[PDB]
Design a protein around this ligand. Structure first.
Ligand code: HEM
Ligand code: HEM
Ligand code: HEM
Ligand SMILES: C[C@@]1(c2ccc(Oc3ccccc3)cc2)OC(=O)N(Nc2ccccc2)C1=O
Lengths: 377, 79, 49, 240, 60
């Protein structure tokens, strides 16, 4: 009987069963549902870890080990959480890249909501990482938190405020546990709002050309395409959990607390590398953090810089080359962000930083304009 | 949202199709697929590949300089 | 004139049990569904696992 | 000062994808922690029961636990005595407030416990090569006090006296307690102390690839079946 | 002489009742046979277990 009339299943039907979708959406389109799976994944394992973790300075590092050694299967649950956080970023990255390449950002509202979803998960992962009170957890917590101190005039009252003291201590570990528990529920609401705005127009596709003449039902097609792709997300997640639990995980969080001693070479998680390089590039306190913020906050300027008469980059050889130069540049930032602030590296790191911004703020838009002229448009 | 029946106007196109239980799910998987991937590869290498070798070259050089410059170094201090 | 239509040839997409006119397809009906359903059964059995 | 070298190449018998531990070597390795390392290094997270599963036996585990004295809970007078040795809380803790380890050893703090994975890149190897690779301090550089020199370590210089080849033994078997053999065993054991789940994980891990190798092709085939209809559909435009 | 997959279809897949009954009964055995057959694979390649190691101590 009917899916269409019931006030509840009607939502389901309109979102996952009868929703008209482009016959041609690619694998690149699988990431949104994978981001949903990621969020649920983080939520379940996250929760079971909360049934055993304790938020006090003393027993924090210890309770986590209690989980990995004592609590039945805590190790598998703990690793799925950690590796799930990485996958979540892997997915954010692909998802945001897919939107750039294919012009999807032209759906203003849904793209703007996405940026919010990006910042929310970054906020979430940060608080998360601090939780086990390891060396990197602590020093990473110290670095990132201090960014706020750069803000003129009110900078220090703010860090101390967010600290609940004179430095990252007791009060901060507890509040971070709290905010880290509620954030993913708030994320979940923003994501439903994301999905609402998207349905208003439906999905874009590889060609950037309207698909209203060739829509297919989300259900049999994307239902199975999404299943298959979930299993791929799962294989990749398990491989990590079950063969390489410590691979992305820094060895220093396996050593408790040292507010007195900063490790020789503190290294961000992975997904912060490129942004870490940008912040570091410029030898200035204020300007570094400003460059850092702008490095992410730039996504919301992207739509103003669309210059081409076409939506997607599928028929745009110039933009394509510049897009990959962007990716290749990010990969350079990543490499550099994980390296000591020295000779070859600072200069490479400064040139990659101007390139990132140079290509988004100027190169891409100029390619679009010459592609238009080349076509006589 | 939008519903089938209210999307857009289409006139004059016929679509012929088969039942899944009547066709193969992998017909010429290799016979036609391999050629196809070679072809999509050719079509995109020139745009995708170059920026990455550019990073690759800077990656090996960059680390090379790093090692030779600092550590390996202590070059001449002769007396 | 709508009689100038004709459904195009699907020979190179068809399962071999069909492919031949003269032969009814009811005869391979059970086997062809058998195979495709077995695949799902097995899948769900695996996922069950 | 800031220069340094990295560990050799790992042939452990627990290096590959699927690869158990040589539980016999985990035994020998505990014996090394028992007689030598224990007197300086705290192993705060392992317990006598943890071994029951791995290297010993129910009865054996009790017996080895009984060879020490912990500070048991208070009774009616508000006391604090000592007790035979449980089976439920390793913890031979060589030093009270950590600063006592500093006092004894002189500056240097004998770190962690259930080692490797721990803050040491190249985990087991780094340790193996640290213990097994003590060497003569080359010309040009002195040592503020006869500290102790080690080619690996950060800064090539500092801390721990070379404690391997003082051929302590109690390997039953009939195993020669040599420099290396005692190290291979200690690292092996330390591997298990840091990662007890190691063997179950790779057995699961096996199952994950085996299952994935069944499901992947199958789910893929399910999707192609349903997408058949679109993939082979044919179009024709017939305008007036 | 019909075929196998046909028999399977007639007797068990046609109805979602049997179709479902067959897979739940299929999982019960697959799990048991996969765990066993897979454990033995894990063991045969290792052999520095707590198993073989035991043998040495029925005593105390
Ligand atoms: C017993 C066999 C034994 C082992 C094994 C062991 C290991 C070990 C490691 C892996 C280190 C880490 C080096 C690093 O942090 O990078 C370390 C450090 C110290 N040790 Fe040790 N140790 C064993 C035994 C002993 C014994 C019996 C003593 C006391 C005489 C001792 C001492 C120390 C000290 C001091 C350090 C700190 C080094 C420093 O940072 O200065 N160890 N040990
Ligand atoms: C359901 C909401 C969540 C809860 C209740 C939750 C609970 C926890 C708890 C208790 C810890 C500390 C234990 C441990 O470190 O293993 C933790 C750590 C962490 N979580 Fe979450 N979390 C939630 C959502 C998230 C989200 C959205 C992310 C981002 C994908 C995330 C990524 C992390 C990370 C990176 C850590 C540090 C992991 C580590 O290396 O130990 N979790 N979480
Ligand atoms: C919690 C994080 C996110 C979730 C849960 C999420 C979920 C989804 C889902 C389910 C889709 C449907 C189809 C698809 O897979 O593409 C989608 C499409 C889209 N999302 Fe997200 N996404 C998230 C982060 C982002 C981010 C970071 C952005 C951009 C900053 C973004 C902007 C878009 C856009 C523009 C589309 C358009 C679809 C297209 O053009 O193909 N979303 N998202
Ligand atoms: C995991 C991690 C983290 C998490 C989320 C972040 O959020 C962003 C990610 C990308 C871009 C901007 C913010 C940043 C760092 O949290 C944390 O303590 N660190 N560690 C760290 C190390 C050195 C400097 C700064 C931080 C992270 O990597």
């Amino acid at each position: 009987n009917i899916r269409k009339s019931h006030p509840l299943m009607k939502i389901v039907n309109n979102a996952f069963i009868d929703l008209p979708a482009p016959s041609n959406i690619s694998s690149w389109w699988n990431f949104g549902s994978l981001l949903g799976i990621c969020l649920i994944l983080q939520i379940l394992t996250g929760l079971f870890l909360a049934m055993h973790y304790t938020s006090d300075t003393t027993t924090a590092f210890s309770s986590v080990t209690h989980i990995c050694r004592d609590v039945n299967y805590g190790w598998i649950i703990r690793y799925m959480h950690a590796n799930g956080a990485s996958m979540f970023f892997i997915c954010l990255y692909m998802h945001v890249g897919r939107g750039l390449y294919y012009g999807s950002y032209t759906f203003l509202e849904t793209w703007n909501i996405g940026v919010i979803l990006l910042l929310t998960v970054m906020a979430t992962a940060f608080m998360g990482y601090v939780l086990p009170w390891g060396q990197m957890s602590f020093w990473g917590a110290t670095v990132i938190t201090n960014l706020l101190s750069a803000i003129p005039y009110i900078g220090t009252n703010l860090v101390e405020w967010i600290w609940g003291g004179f430095s990252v201590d007791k009060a901060t570990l507890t509040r971070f546990f709290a905010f880290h528990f509620i954030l993913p529920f708030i994320i979940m609401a923003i994501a439903m709002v994301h999905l609402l705005f998207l349905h208003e127009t439906g999905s874009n596709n590889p060609t950037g050309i309207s698909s209203d003449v060739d829509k297919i039902p989300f259900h049999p097609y994307y239902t199975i395409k999404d299943i298959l792709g979930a299993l791929l997300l799962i294989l990749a997640l398990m491989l990590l959990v079950l063969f390489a639990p410590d691979l992305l995980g820094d060895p220093d969080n396996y050593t408790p607390a040292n507010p007195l001693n900063t490790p020789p070479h503190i290294k961000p998680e992975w997904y912060f590398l490129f942004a870490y390089a940008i912040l570091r590039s410029i030898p200035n306190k204020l300007g570094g953090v400003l460059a850092l913020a702008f490095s992410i906050l730039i996504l919301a300027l992207i739509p103003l810089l669309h210059t081409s008469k076409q939506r997607s980059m599928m028929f745009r050889p110039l933009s394509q080359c510049l897009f990959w130069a962007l990716v290749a540049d990010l990969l350079t930032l990543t490499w550099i962000g994980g390296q000591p602030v020295e000779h070859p590296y600072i200069t490479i790191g400064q040139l990659a930083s101007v390139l990132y911004f140079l290509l988004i703020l100027v190169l891409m838009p100029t390619a679009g304009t010459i592609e238009n002229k080349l076509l006589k448009w | 949202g939008r519903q089938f029946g209210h999307l857009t106007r289409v006139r004059h196109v016929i679509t012929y199709s088969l039942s899944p239980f009547e066709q193969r799910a992998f017909p010429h998987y290799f016979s036609k697929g391999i050629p196809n991937v070679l072809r999509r590869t050719r079509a995109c290498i020139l745009r995708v590949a170059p920026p990455f070798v550019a990073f690759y070259l800077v990656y090996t050089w960059g680390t090379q300089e790093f090692e030779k410059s600092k550590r390996k170094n202590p070059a001449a201090y002769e007396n | 004139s709508h009689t100038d239509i004709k459904v195009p040839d699907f020979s190179d997409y068809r399962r071999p049990e069909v492919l031949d006119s003269t032969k009814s397809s009811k005869e391979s009906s059970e086997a062809r569904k058998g195979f495709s359903y077995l695949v799902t059964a097995t899948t769900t059995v695996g996922v069950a696992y | 000062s800031d220069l340094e070298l990295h560990p050799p190449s790992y042939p452990w018998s627990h290096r590959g994808l699927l690869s158990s531990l040589d539980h016999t070597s985990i035994r020998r390795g505990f014996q090394v922690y028992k007689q030598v390392c224990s007197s300086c290094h705290s192993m705060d997270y392992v317990a006598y029961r943890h071994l029951v599963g791995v290297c010993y036996t129910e009865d054996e585990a009790k017996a080895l636990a009984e060879e020490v004295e912990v500070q048991d809970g208070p009774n009616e007078d508000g006391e604090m005595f000592m007790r035979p040795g449980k089976l439920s809380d390793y913890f031979p803790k060589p030093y009270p407030n950590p600063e006592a380890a500093r006092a004894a050893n002189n500056g240097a703090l004998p770190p962690d416990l259930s080692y490797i994975v721990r803050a040491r890149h190249g985990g087991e190897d780094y340790v193996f090569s640290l213990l097994t690779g003590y060497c003569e301090p080359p010309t040009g550089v002195s040592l503020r006090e006869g500290l102790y020199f080690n080619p690996y370590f950060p800064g090539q210089a500092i801390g721990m006296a070379p404690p391997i080849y003082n051929e302590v033994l109690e390997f039953d078997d009939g195993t020669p307690a040599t420099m290396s053999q005692v190290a291979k065993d200690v690292c092996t054991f330390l591997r298990w102390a840091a990662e007890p789940e190691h063997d179950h994980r790779k057995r699961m891990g096996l199952k994950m690839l085996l299952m994935m190798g069944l499901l992947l092709p199958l789910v893929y085939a399910m999707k192609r079946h349903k997408w058949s209809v679109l993939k082979s559909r044919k179009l024709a435009y017939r305008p007036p | 002489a019909p075929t196998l997959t046909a028999r399977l279809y007639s007797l068990l897949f046609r109805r979602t009742s049997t179709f479902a009954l067959t897979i739940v009964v299929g999982a019960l055995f697959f799990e048991r046979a996969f765990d066993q057959g897979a454990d033995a694979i894990y063991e045969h390649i290792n052999e520095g277990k707590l198993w073989k190691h035991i043998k040495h101590k029925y005593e105390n």
